[PDB]
Design a protein around this ligand. Sequence first.
Ligand code: FMN
Ligand code: FMN
Ligand code: FMN
Ligand code: FMN
Ligand code: CAC
Ligand code: CAC
Ligand code: CAC
Ligand code: CAC
Ligand code: FE
Ligand code: FE
Ligand code: FE
Ligand code: FE
Lengths: 399, 399, 399, 399
Amino acid sequence: SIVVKNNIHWVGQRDWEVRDFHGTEYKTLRGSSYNSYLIREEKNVLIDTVDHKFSREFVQNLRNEIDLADIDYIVINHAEEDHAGALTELMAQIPDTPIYCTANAIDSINGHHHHPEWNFNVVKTGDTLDIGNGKQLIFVETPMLHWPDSMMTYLTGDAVLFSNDAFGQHYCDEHLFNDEVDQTELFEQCQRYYANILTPFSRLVTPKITEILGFNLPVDMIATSHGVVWRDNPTQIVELYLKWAADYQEDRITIFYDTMSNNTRMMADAIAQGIAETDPRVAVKIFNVARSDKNEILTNVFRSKGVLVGTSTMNNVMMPKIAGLVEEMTGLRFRNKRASAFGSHGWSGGAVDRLSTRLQDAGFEMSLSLKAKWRPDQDALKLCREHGREIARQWALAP
Amino acid sequence: SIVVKNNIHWVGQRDWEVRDFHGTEYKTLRGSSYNSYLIREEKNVLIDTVDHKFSREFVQNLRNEIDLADIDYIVINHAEEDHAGALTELMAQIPDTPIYCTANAIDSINGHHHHPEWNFNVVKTGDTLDIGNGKQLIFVETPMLHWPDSMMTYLTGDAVLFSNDAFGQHYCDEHLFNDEVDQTELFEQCQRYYANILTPFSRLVTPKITEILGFNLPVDMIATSHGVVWRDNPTQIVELYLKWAADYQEDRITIFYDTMSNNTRMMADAIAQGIAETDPRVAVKIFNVARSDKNEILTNVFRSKGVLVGTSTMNNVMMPKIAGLVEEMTGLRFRNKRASAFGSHGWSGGAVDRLSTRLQDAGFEMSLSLKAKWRPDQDALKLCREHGREIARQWALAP
Amino acid sequence: SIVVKNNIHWVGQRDWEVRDFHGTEYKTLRGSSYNSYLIREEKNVLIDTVDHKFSREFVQNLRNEIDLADIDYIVINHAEEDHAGALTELMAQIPDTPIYCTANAIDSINGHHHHPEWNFNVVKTGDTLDIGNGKQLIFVETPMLHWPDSMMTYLTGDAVLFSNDAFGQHYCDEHLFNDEVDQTELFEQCQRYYANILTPFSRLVTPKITEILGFNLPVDMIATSHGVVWRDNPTQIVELYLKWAADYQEDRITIFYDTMSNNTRMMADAIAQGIAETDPRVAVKIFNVARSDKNEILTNVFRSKGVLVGTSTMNNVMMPKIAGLVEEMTGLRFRNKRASAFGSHGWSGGAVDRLSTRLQDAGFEMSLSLKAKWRPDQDALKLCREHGREIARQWALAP
Amino acid sequence: SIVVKNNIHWVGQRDWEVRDFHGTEYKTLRGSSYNSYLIREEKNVLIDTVDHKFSREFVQNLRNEIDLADIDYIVINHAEEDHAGALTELMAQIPDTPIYCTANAIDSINGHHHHPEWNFNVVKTGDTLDIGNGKQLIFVETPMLHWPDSMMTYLTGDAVLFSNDAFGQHYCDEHLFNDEVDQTELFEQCQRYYANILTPFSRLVTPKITEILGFNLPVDMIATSHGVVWRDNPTQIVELYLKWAADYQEDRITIFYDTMSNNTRMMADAIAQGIAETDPRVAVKIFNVARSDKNEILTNVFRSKGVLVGTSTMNNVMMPKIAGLVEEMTGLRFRNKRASAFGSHGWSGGAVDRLSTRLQDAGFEMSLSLKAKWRPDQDALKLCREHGREIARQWALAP
Ligand SMILES: Cc1cc2nc3c(=O)[nH]c(=O)nc-3n(C[C@H](O)[C@H](O)[C@H](O)COP(=O)(O)O)c2cc1C
Ligand SMILES: Cc1cc2nc3c(=O)[nH]c(=O)nc-3n(C[C@H](O)[C@H](O)[C@H](O)COP(=O)(O)O)c2cc1C
Ligand SMILES: Cc1cc2nc3c(=O)[nH]c(=O)nc-3n(C[C@H](O)[C@H](O)[C@H](O)COP(=O)(O)O)c2cc1C
Ligand SMILES: Cc1cc2nc3c(=O)[nH]c(=O)nc-3n(C[C@H](O)[C@H](O)[C@H](O)COP(=O)(O)O)c2cc1C
Ligand SMILES: C[As](C)(=O)[O-]
Ligand SMILES: C[As](C)(=O)[O-]
Ligand SMILES: C[As](C)(=O)[O-]
Ligand SMILES: C[As](C)(=O)[O-]
Ligand SMILES: [Fe+3]
Ligand SMILES: [Fe+3]
Ligand SMILES: [Fe+3]
Ligand SMILES: [Fe+3]
């Protein structure tokens, strides 16, 4: 365990090895951590647990900190298995202990653990739980940030916001605090997290932060459920989220494609050359989706004013990894971004139009598509470079 | 080089290392080979080249066999880069050498190599090229088996059918002939090849084989462009293709899914238990698409009377790898097969219906979907097992 | 659960998804299963549990079969986590239940579970446990097949040998019995298992099987801890093990290497051509260790009369993946096999001699090494082919 | 092509897709590029070519820039295939063109291309080649930075140092200059490159840089063979190399291991906790070698004052991936670093001592090893944490 502040004790778990979250949909190249907190005032409160894979360790470690029967209340901000995953093993030892959570969390907790007999206590925004010594917890519902069950818990006096997933990041380090870790790595992990997980809930971010601030509660620390506790200039992460939620983009274009014989790759490289020659302000990145980290592609899309996506025609349809990434983007809801589809074909083609239609349906504002037959010769590569120049001109930011 | 028969010399390339074809769409776990043949009669004829990656070796090796200027004719059955990939380097040495190919192959050859000045000679089915000593080549067009440019070349007297991709397989071995290799491995590779590449052209297979047989030409050997030369009971591969083309299926069900927290996996396992208990005749296979070889999944689909496909709901859409595999299956055109969609959701769901509609559009005859919320408890697992029992009963073959 | 025979009930777990065992040292491309058996006579006996990852399911499923308090005895044949992994969760419900195991298993069980207070009962070979109705269990110690704690348990009357890891295989199927599954796949998985895991204990295999047979106990079934129950001609797997233990080899040579710029790959391919031309009886396989399944390489080594291993020189040492595989082979103890080291270098070299010395130390009988500088030209490739011809002649089996 | 300065034209190749160099020994997660330069004064000089995979493109692109017959001289700084890989295709068009290179480069060029008839001109340090308009090239031999053939070429007047591999990095971007790319990414790639490739030649770095500076030649730009041209404060990369060569280390400890059942992982995590609690100045990183990027582990080792390496005992030897990484480290020659070996065992063990001996032989100054049996309980984890505390105290930097 590690002291957070006063009588707040981090009793979580670092996970150096973990490389896959949500099946294989989110790759954690710097591992992760699962933060749980024990507050010891007149009442003893446990905030969240840890991933199910560490259930045994979590309960044994908690015993080393406190006799389990001395825990008064358990707060579950969110019932995804990376936070409530040790709850069944803990509850087996202290079956009657009250659990405080949102109404939706009863559904999600029962959904995973199947113990509807536990003593649940529904909390709504503004509800309070007194823990003594002039301190209390104030609950704030945050539905769809990022699950229906989600909430945050604020501790008065100590002025700590327990934000669960919000403001967190998958970044394993033995140091608990934000000022103690490498800043470049920290912020890279924060942005990858927002881009890949929170983008579709962006419309909910500014209203919820606005609501919380209107409570006029001081924030000395933000203790999230993943990665660092924000204790040096904690509002920095809040301000980033406000920037990130507003249909964020930089002067940046991302190009990604799949290819069977490199023809669409040659088109992509020519497009990039045309962009770079025409508007040097623009940062350009190119990825082969079959050979690159998918989450890195999506973080780039999030950061970009526009994208070009490429596929050849394969059995009259799109290449499968491109079809999958377009499905995924549809669910992520990127906004205010432009796109252009491109690709090669051997005879009747069709995949480029099929792709451009799905990109439009995903919310991208479409420019003209670029098509070529078989392998582009010198003449065709010139047309590909010009497509890049024309896309750069059309998408250029104001001087 | 290796003697095929009489004056036919294999001058190809074995590829022990290759693991990816068509980008990463076809995984060659036993490597591959690229067969090219040099026939030396009164005229010298080269049939096909090899993959572009071995262009230097191919030309140097061919020089070891024959002075390049002594080659009279070049036959290109098919211009995909794994067979015509060394053509530019060869043609640079002997620029005026005549090339015999289909009309469509002029387009595809020019498409890849950009030398429209080469001396192309269009051949149609039944056209002949005399090479002396009472032998000649007879060309047979085979459009869309598997490209518009595809054809086969038959050599009279020696009675050898050069079938290019047809009847071939990706299976690297130093032994050239079918009777010289491991039979289980050979036939596994043949079926994986047909299932993953030729399924969508199945309707063309029986008419083309019927046409070729109606020529009343003896076949002593079938010399393909990948893997073994069929010289012991060569019609065995032809008969397999006739079986494979007729909307082939065995008494077999394939279950595949993706999952973020294992809920859909639990459903899949319960379904399988219900099937196995109800109809023991049925071979059942289960795959997590995020953790398994995709081509092996598709070979199983090809072999199956039906499939169950599973996904959870992720950001109101399907899991991406499932969306991609459904796109791919749509292009493959499986026929006479049944399906049932299944999966878990947390709140409003939607992915199962989205999946079932796309499976129907891909040609599967749909049975009822199976849905569950969060993690299935004992009661829900019973419903999943019963879904399996009911699917087994509905899809059962006649006693 | 599934009936094995009479009152023996399979209460295990199928694992369709698992792809890695022992870290990543053993890849299970066809999944696996964990077999546990409940015998219900006058006494109720549980034989083994399942992998720790399925602990919750195992106990819940066992409850569906029997009230936990009705279990009289628990037999633990082997305490590796894939079999005793659910023991802590089970013992928490029935703390006083007697456990029967070898002396060494007390050490290994306490080693993993840390409950030395459990009621252990040491069994030695020939000890018996009466379970009523004229049936009893007879224990047979099998130390280092494959752990110090290992044993088998034989059930009289029903004539079932519970062999735990021995005779098992990682092969997931819903059908329990050997006659119900695909035979090619079954035997492939059995051999991969023996080659990769049991080879170093081969010297113990023939004496232990000899001892068991000398008991004159009928064997109607062999119920292992992984994969199928052998009930049709069960001695078939026993006879295979006797063949496999006797320093098994076929007329087969395996070539494997790593390479930075393909020079050692070119040497390997030339060597193979020389072998194939010289002794057509020999099955040859070639693997790039950086691009191939390591367990498949080792299964081939096991099946081979000899191996050639290749590395270039990298920073005055061997390429790392080759150093690792030689370490692993040293621990596996291959016997009666021949080897030859080969590779390329740029200047002073040294890796080939370094490799040949380690192969000798691993137990291989060494033939001359083959060395080349940079990329082999035509002359050097001739020398590589001749090395193959000479190796084939030297290692040839009798006519 | 892109203008570098005055009459110097970049005529290289960007490689967005490439992910593997030197087999799979160096992973390029941000791609790479191959820089070649054409200088057009009174004489026309080509400096280097590009990777063999882009040979066709390179020659076609060069034709677009200049008639091949107008090239006067070719300079080959280094004959590895990523730079001289297009030389055979270029030389086929202009066979008589003089090549300037080191004596050793004749051996390496002939080694790869097998055209000893080409007109080679040996250059030694200080030799000059006049190209007119008051400019000339001055050659500087740099043997073993990083091959025997390596050299740099300096262009007077324009004051550009063509350093080939030295000062380069694998970092693909359409922008050519150092001030035009993301600085964090650039410097990350520079350090990964030095750590993984140049560490063993560190002793040669300070003398060669000292020699070059003693020439009193102004340096306006450093045009390397990979990544950016250094044109803004170009000496920044030179100063980094001087820091990196001096047995570089930060206040940082790297822990890495392999594990079959997570016991050694538990030890590693406890060790890390002890370090972090004892000396908060120290940055700690932990990697499972079977699940992490190997080059990232080695970059961390390079940056570290010490390492702890972990393995269990497997068949009386070390786990193979650990044996391979120790072989690789032996060749890399890390200096002034401390180490401690650790790991778990089941019975007789031996792998930890085996590992500690090899680490000592690799140049690490050894502290005591840490050993545990099976899975560490609470008592054993305390000993592991204390090992961490004791290692932190011993290795602490001065206050
Ligand atoms: C397996 C396969 C299936 C194909 N199916 C089609 C098709 O249905 N329609 C078409 O016009 N071209 C088809 N082609 C041709 C490719 O689209 C053509 O080779 C294209 O130039 C490839 O571009 P790429 O190298 O970027 O993949 C197919 C090619 C392959 C290898
Ligand atoms: C990233 C993510 C996004 C989700 N989006 C939705 C959604 O849009 N609608 C819904 O009903 N459930 C959604 N869920 C809930 C899952 O569908 C629910 O956890 C389900 O039981 C998971 O099944 P699985 O373990 O097989 O993946 C989401 C879950 C995650 C982790
Ligand atoms: C990173 C690296 C390190 C090398 N170290 C050595 C060395 O220490 N001694 C030597 O003689 N050659 C060394 N070489 C040269 C290679 O051994 C030479 O290129 C060889 O032909 C490569 O064979 P391969 O393509 O099979 O890897 C090295 C090459 C590279 C790329
Ligand atoms: C395949 C295998 C081989 C083993 N060989 C040995 C051995 O030779 N000597 C020994 O003392 N323990 C041996 N063991 C036991 C392990 O060292 C023991 O389980 C250890 O605690 C594993 O540590 P880990 O989880 O970090 O891999 C072996 C274990 C396995 C699975
Ligand atoms: C069980 As109590 C009275 O310590 O909350
Ligand atoms: C060029 As000729 C006459 O040998 O075909
Ligand atoms: C606890 As009993 C008497 O059923 O073995
Ligand atoms: C061939 As010249 C005279 O242009 O160097
Ligand atoms: Fe108040
Ligand atoms: Fe005739
Ligand atoms: Fe008796
Ligand atoms: Fe001068």
